[PDB]
Design an enzyme around this catalytic site. Structure first.
Site, PDB file in Angstrom:
ATOM      1  N   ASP B  70       0.726  -1.128   0.035  1.00 55.29           N
ATOM      2  CA  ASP B  70       0.243   0.063  -0.020  1.00 55.29           C
ATOM      3  C   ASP B  70       0.707   1.203  -0.161  1.00 55.29           C
ATOM      4  O   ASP B  70       1.887   1.332   0.892  1.00 55.29           O
ATOM      5  CB  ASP B  70      -0.916  -0.020   1.160  1.00 55.29           C
ATOM      6  CG  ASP B  70      -1.968   1.096   1.219  1.00 55.29           C
ATOM      7  OD1 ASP B  70      -1.443   2.086   1.524  1.00 55.29           O
ATOM      8  OD2 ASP B  70      -3.061   0.766   0.675  1.00 55.29           O
TER       9      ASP B  70
HETATM   10  O1  LIG Z   1     -11.543   4.621  -0.036  1.00 51.18           O
HETATM   11  C1  LIG Z   1     -10.869   3.664  -0.169  1.00 51.18           C
HETATM   12  C2  LIG Z   1     -11.278   2.232  -0.111  1.00 51.18           C
HETATM   13  C3  LIG Z   1     -10.582   1.184  -0.101  1.00 51.18           C
HETATM   14  N1  LIG Z   1      -9.246   1.067  -0.519  1.00 51.18           N
HETATM   15  C4  LIG Z   1      -8.344   0.167  -1.010  1.00 51.18           C
HETATM   16  C5  LIG Z   1      -8.706  -1.082  -0.065  1.00 51.18           C
HETATM   17  C6  LIG Z   1      -9.546  -2.035  -1.109  1.00 51.18           C
HETATM   18  O2  LIG Z   1      -9.094  -3.426  -1.044  1.00 51.18           O
HETATM   19  C7  LIG Z   1      -8.726  -1.732  -2.410  1.00 51.18           C
HETATM   20  C8  LIG Z   1      -9.986  -1.792  -3.615  1.00 51.18           C
HETATM   21  O3  LIG Z   1      -9.228  -1.219  -4.877  1.00 51.18           O
HETATM   22  P1  LIG Z   1      -7.803  -1.606  -5.446  1.00 51.18           P
HETATM   23  O4  LIG Z   1      -7.464  -2.888  -4.437  1.00 51.18           O
HETATM   24  O5  LIG Z   1      -7.465  -1.536  -6.627  1.00 51.18           O
HETATM   25  O6  LIG Z   1      -6.776  -0.443  -4.464  1.00 51.18           O
HETATM   26  P2  LIG Z   1      -5.072  -0.266  -4.684  1.00 51.18           P
HETATM   27  O7  LIG Z   1      -4.868   0.805  -3.634  1.00 51.18           O
HETATM   28  O8  LIG Z   1      -5.166   0.132  -6.093  1.00 51.18           O
HETATM   29  O9  LIG Z   1      -4.267  -1.404  -4.389  1.00 51.18           O
HETATM   30  P3  LIG Z   1      -4.588  -3.021  -3.844  1.00 51.18           P
HETATM   31  O10 LIG Z   1      -5.071  -3.853  -5.069  1.00 51.18           O
HETATM   32  O11 LIG Z   1      -3.172  -3.466  -3.476  1.00 51.18           O
HETATM   33  O12 LIG Z   1      -5.222  -3.023  -2.708  1.00 51.18           O
HETATM   34  O13 LIG Z   1      -8.442  -0.471  -2.244  1.00 51.18           O
HETATM   35  C9  LIG Z   1      -8.539   2.401  -0.911  1.00 51.18           C
HETATM   36  O14 LIG Z   1      -7.441   2.510  -1.172  1.00 51.18           O
HETATM   37  N2  LIG Z   1      -9.595   3.618  -0.546  1.00 51.18           N
END
Ligand SMILES: O=c1ccn([C@H]2C[C@H](O)[C@@H](COP(=O)(O)OP(=O)(O)OP(=O)(O)O)O2)c(=O)[nH]1
Ligand SMILES: O=c1ccn([C@H]2C[C@H](O)[C@@H](COP(=O)(O)OP(=O)(O)OP(=O)(O)O)O2)c(=O)[nH]1
Ligand SMILES: O=c1ccn([C@H]2C[C@H](O)[C@@H](COP(=O)(O)OP(=O)(O)OP(=O)(O)O)O2)c(=O)[nH]1
Ligand SMILES: O=c1ccn([C@H]2C[C@H](O)[C@@H](COP(=O)(O)OP(=O)(O)OP(=O)(O)O)O2)c(=O)[nH]1
Ligand code: NA
Lengths: 185, 185
Positions: B70
């Site tokens: 993250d």
């Molecule tokens: O307001 C929010 C809500 C959720 N999430 C995170 C937790 C969730 O599991 C995920 C869903 O989208 P994605 O997984 O694409 O997020 P990312 O930050 O691009 O990376 P990762 O896939 O490693 O979670 O994003 C956020 O960052 N912001």
């Protein structure tokens, strides 16, 4: 050469081992609840405990690296802790006699920008033991200080027939691995 | 090695970087609430989130090694999240502008016999940013899904004067530090 090392442990054996590394460090401990949840594996717990011990001290020294550790003696899923009385010590040994068991030691290392926890398992095979042998050794009061009612060092060594794993881990700390994780600090 | 490797991320950037290890692995859909407690520090919360993503998938697939990560864009102990799709992206782009801020990325690797969390921190310095430039960057959905309202990749690359740390960490995955850690899994 930036962070001070701390060994959150008052186990002489863990101290004897960590000196091997040849690294200046202090000894600082803060009691923590040794509660073990039933619906959890030993590996989970031994790891959870070593984690707690190291954190309680790390919360007190944010800019330090703290090493927590914990060992368990287990056979058939069950794990024997320290004997409450010289008699439970005899029972524990009667159970380890003439067979094998697992010794699980978990080590946790905490820093503000890096944390690592892992466990090391070793199988220990015991020669069949006798009451005389069991009580004589109990006399020394050695088993009274350890989980499983025995130490692999000293008079206990006569019961161990052989091991498969790490001797130092059975003593309380797997130095090779511990030393290797520290290199990432 | 005896454990399968899993990447618990939806991120196409974390996937391209992970491929650089030339190690077989699979990608799993994680569902976790990005609720971050204000009582804790940036460096803490980020590590905590990486640690939650990973743990969610490890929980379902206990026999595997799970990577979770993250990233955060923090300016003065204050961190900018993802715009609710408004002038949010625009406004903060005026914050970073003409000065440095920190991009903190935390990677967590879960396994039943070993877990590891750590964070990389890179200093990012921008050139002074103008209005015409920001919005033109907005249209292309690009600055509206990547925290900070910018991507060092693509058009944002032009906003960056220089960095001090690991470019790949800014992309969302300190692959070089990740690999090393895996040599111990
Ligand atoms: O307001 C929010 C809500 C959720 N999430 C995170 C937790 C969730 O599991 C995920 C869903 O989208 P994605 O997984 O694409 O997020 P990312 O930050 O691009 O990376 P990762 O896939 O490693 O979670 O994003 C956020 O960052 N912001
Ligand atoms: O019944 C007890 C007493 C203490 N402790 C923990 C609290 C503290 O973290 C540490 C203090 O040293 P002690 O000698 O009591 O335990 P140990 O397991 O033999 O060694 P260590 O110092 O590594 O805990 O042990 C327990 O887990 N159970
Ligand atoms: O009373 C309790 C509470 C929790 N746990 C275990 C199960 C739970 O999933 C885990 C919490 O995380 P852990 O302390 O094992 O590791 P961490 O995630 O590195 O800790 P932190 O939450 O401080 O980042 O500890 C227990 O055994 N007993
Ligand atoms: O709900 C939350 C939100 C954030 N954090 C962050 C801040 C904290 O410093 C870090 C490590 O967890 P914590 O401080 O709660 O330690 P713990 O109580 O030992 O964790 P556990 O309950 O997993 O044993 O994770 C949490 O722990 N819990
Ligand atoms: Na490591």
């Amino acid at each position: 050469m930036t962070k001070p090392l701390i060994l959150a442990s008052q186990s002489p054996r863990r101290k004897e081992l960590l000196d091997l590394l040849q690294l200046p460090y202090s000894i600082i401990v803060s009691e923590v609840e040794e509660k073990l949840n039933r619906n959890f594996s030993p590996e989970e717990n031994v790891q959870w405990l070593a984690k707690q011990k190291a954190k309680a001290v790390a919360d007190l020294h944010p800019h330090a690296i703290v090493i927590g550790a914990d060992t368990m003696v287990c056979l058939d899923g069950e794990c024997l802790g320290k004997p409450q009385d010289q008699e439970e010590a005899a029972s524990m040994l009667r159970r380890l006699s003439g067979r094998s068991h697992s010794v699980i030691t978990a080590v946790s290392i905490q820093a503000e920008n890096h944390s690592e926890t892992f466990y090391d398992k070793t199988e220990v095979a015991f020669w069949s033991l006798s009451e005389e042998e069991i009580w004589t050794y109990i006399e020394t009061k050695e088993p009274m200080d350890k989980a499983g009612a025995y130490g692999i060092q000293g008079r206990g060594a006569l019961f161990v027939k052989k091991i498969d794993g790490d001797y130092y881990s059975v003593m309380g700390l797997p130095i090779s691995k511990t030393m290797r994780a520290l290199r990432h600090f």
